[PDB]
Amino acid sequence: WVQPITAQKPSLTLWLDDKMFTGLINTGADVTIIKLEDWPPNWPITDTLTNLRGIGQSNNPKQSSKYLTWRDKENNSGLIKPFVIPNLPVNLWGRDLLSQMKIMMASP
Amino acid sequence: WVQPITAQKPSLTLWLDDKMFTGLINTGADVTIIKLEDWPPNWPITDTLTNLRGIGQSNNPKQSSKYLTWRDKENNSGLIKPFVIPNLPVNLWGRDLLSQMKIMMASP
C-alpha cells in the first residue's frame, strides 16, 4: 500500500491479538503507545523503570506484560509490546512496529 | 530518495533560508519545531496561542516571525513557519513540511 503524508493524521488500523485498534503513524516515536481508555481491562500490564521523553517526560509508564501479535488487513503479522498511558489523544504506532511492516518513505 | 523506517531515528538534512539544519522526520505532528539552541539569534520569533500537546504536559512555543524558505538537496523548495522551543533534543520535521516535499509512505 501507499499513503501520502498530508496535513491530515496518517492513520492505521490493525489487530493486536484479537482486538482492532486505530492509531496515528508516528515516525517520531521510538515505541508504540496504546491509550489506557482503549486498553482491555483483562490484558495484564506491568511496571517499567524506563522514561518516555519528548515535550516533557513520563516516568515509569506501564507496559503490556505480554507481547501482542499485530496483524494487518493483508495478514502480515509480528510482535509488539506497547506502553499503556492515560490522557493520550490517539494511539501511537511507533517505529518498533513500523519497522516490522517494512515501510519506506519516498519522494517523487 | 527513499528511506526505510527502522529503529534508528529517520533524519533529514535541509536548508531553512540560508542555514542548514538536520532534523527528525515526525509524521506525528502537523507542525515543525526547531530547537531554540539551533535558532539563529537574529531571526525574529514571536509569542503564539498554539499549545503543543506533550507527554502529560503542554508547552507554549515561540514561532518564527517570518516564513522561511526550505530547500532540500534536490533543490525542491517551499515555505514553512516553524515553532521554536528550548530543551528539545532534535529538530522535528512535521507534516506541514513533509507534505510540501510530497513524501509518501509505502509498503510492499
Binding site: 515505541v31 519528548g54 | 498554539t50 503543543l52 506533550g54 533534543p89 522535528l92
Partner: peptide
C-alpha cells in the same frame, strides 16, 4: 525512549 503527537 523518545516520543515526539504535538499538534
Amino acid at each position: 525512549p523518545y516520543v515526539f503527537a504535538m499538534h
